[PDB]
Write an enzyme that holds these catalytic residues in place. Structure first.
Site, PDB file in Angstrom:
ATOM      1  N   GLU A  35      33.241  40.082  32.011  1.00  0.00           N
ATOM      2  CA  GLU A  35      32.822  40.356  33.394  1.00  0.00           C
ATOM      3  C   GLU A  35      31.528  39.691  33.796  1.00  0.00           C
ATOM      4  O   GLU A  35      31.296  39.649  35.012  1.00  0.00           O
ATOM      5  CB  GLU A  35      32.711  41.857  33.701  1.00  0.00           C
ATOM      6  CG  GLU A  35      32.897  42.241  35.166  1.00  0.00           C
ATOM      7  CD  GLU A  35      33.994  43.173  35.566  1.00  0.00           C
ATOM      8  OE1 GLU A  35      34.585  43.913  34.801  1.00  0.00           O
ATOM      9  OE2 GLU A  35      34.270  43.117  36.796  1.00  0.00           O
ATOM     10  N   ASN A  46      31.624  41.260  45.708  1.00  0.00           N
ATOM     11  CA  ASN A  46      32.832  42.012  46.096  1.00  0.00           C
ATOM     12  C   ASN A  46      33.131  41.665  47.557  1.00  0.00           C
ATOM     13  O   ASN A  46      32.323  40.955  48.179  1.00  0.00           O
ATOM     14  CB  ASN A  46      32.646  43.504  45.866  1.00  0.00           C
ATOM     15  CG  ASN A  46      33.676  44.140  44.968  1.00  0.00           C
ATOM     16  OD1 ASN A  46      34.905  44.133  45.211  1.00  0.00           O
ATOM     17  ND2 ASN A  46      33.191  44.713  43.866  1.00  0.00           N
ATOM     18  N   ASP A  48      33.659  43.892  50.352  1.00  0.00           N
ATOM     19  CA  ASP A  48      32.950  44.784  51.266  1.00  0.00           C
ATOM     20  C   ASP A  48      31.522  44.337  51.480  1.00  0.00           C
ATOM     21  O   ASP A  48      30.956  44.869  52.446  1.00  0.00           O
ATOM     22  CB  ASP A  48      33.098  46.238  50.838  1.00  0.00           C
ATOM     23  CG  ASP A  48      32.974  46.382  49.340  1.00  0.00           C
ATOM     24  OD1 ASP A  48      32.196  45.651  48.713  1.00  0.00           O
ATOM     25  OD2 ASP A  48      33.722  47.240  48.829  1.00  0.00           O
ATOM     26  N   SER A  50      29.323  44.571  49.081  1.00  0.00           N
ATOM     27  CA  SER A  50      28.662  45.160  47.896  1.00  0.00           C
ATOM     28  C   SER A  50      28.760  44.080  46.789  1.00  0.00           C
ATOM     29  O   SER A  50      29.484  43.053  46.869  1.00  0.00           O
ATOM     30  CB  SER A  50      29.191  46.487  47.428  1.00  0.00           C
ATOM     31  OG  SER A  50      30.316  46.374  46.581  1.00  0.00           O
ATOM     32  N   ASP A  52      28.124  43.185  42.345  1.00  0.00           N
ATOM     33  CA  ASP A  52      28.121  43.505  40.922  1.00  0.00           C
ATOM     34  C   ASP A  52      26.959  42.722  40.339  1.00  0.00           C
ATOM     35  O   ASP A  52      26.886  41.510  40.556  1.00  0.00           O
ATOM     36  CB  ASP A  52      29.435  43.154  40.274  1.00  0.00           C
ATOM     37  CG  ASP A  52      30.485  44.112  40.825  1.00  0.00           C
ATOM     38  OD1 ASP A  52      30.875  43.995  41.982  1.00  0.00           O
ATOM     39  OD2 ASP A  52      30.842  44.990  40.023  1.00  0.00           O
ATOM     40  N   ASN A  59      28.517  47.971  40.088  1.00  0.00           N
ATOM     41  CA  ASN A  59      28.763  47.777  41.529  1.00  0.00           C
ATOM     42  C   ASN A  59      27.670  48.500  42.343  1.00  0.00           C
ATOM     43  O   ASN A  59      27.143  49.551  41.927  1.00  0.00           O
ATOM     44  CB  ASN A  59      30.175  48.227  41.912  1.00  0.00           C
ATOM     45  CG  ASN A  59      30.352  48.305  43.412  1.00  0.00           C
ATOM     46  OD1 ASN A  59      30.673  49.384  43.917  1.00  0.00           O
ATOM     47  ND2 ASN A  59      30.132  47.225  44.137  1.00  0.00           N
TER      48      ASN A  59
END
Length: 129
Positions: A35, A46, A48, A50, A52, A59
Site C-alpha cells: 500500500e 482517494n 472524495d 480525502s 491516505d 485514510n
C-alpha cells in the site's frame, strides 16, 4: 523516507504491533509493502478528496486530519501531518487503534486484498526478527 523490509520489521516490532490483537507482524510489513512501498511520504489520493498518508496508508476522513475532507471523523485525533513525517510512532499508535476498533485490518485494500493469510511469518524472516 524509505525503510527496508528489515528496518521496518525492527521498528514495527519495538512499538507493539509485534503480534497485536491477534494479527502477526508479517501482516504489518506485508500491508506496508503493497500500500505504500515502505515510504512514509506516500500520498494516495482517494476520490472524495480525502487521502491516505504514511507507511500504513491511514485514510483522512476516518482516522486523521488534513483539511480538505468533507466530514473527517478523525478517530485517532491525529493530524495527518505526523504520519507523513519519517517517524512511524504516529501510525503505529493510530494503527493500534484503527484495527482494534472492532473491525480488523479490514480497511486496508492491500492487507485485505493481498496479505490476508500467506502464512504470515515470511515477511519478517531473513531479517534478524
Amino acid at each position: 523516507k524509505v525503510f527496508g523490509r528489515c528496518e521496518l520489521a525492527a521498528a514495527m516490532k519495538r512499538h507493539g504491533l509485534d503480534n497485536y490483537r491477534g494479527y502477526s507482524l508479517g501482516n504489518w510489513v506485508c500491508a506496508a509493502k503493497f500500500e505504500s512501498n515502505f515510504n512514509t511520504q506516500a500520498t494516495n489520493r482517494n476520490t472524495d478528496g480525502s487521502t491516505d498518508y504514511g507507511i500504513l496508508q491511514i485514510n483522512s476522513r476516518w482516522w486523521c486530519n488534513d483539511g480538505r475532507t468533507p466530514g473527517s471523523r478523525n478517530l485517532c485525533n491525529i493530524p495527518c501531518s505526523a504520519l507523513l513525517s519519517s517517524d512511524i510512532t504516529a501510525s503505529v499508535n493510530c494503527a493500534k487503534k484503527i484495527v482494534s476498533d472492532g473491525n480488523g485490518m479490514n480497511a486496508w485494500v492491500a492487507w485485505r486484498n493481498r496479505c490476508k493469510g500467506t502464512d504470515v511469518q515470511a515477511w519478517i524472516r531473513g531479517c534478524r526478527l
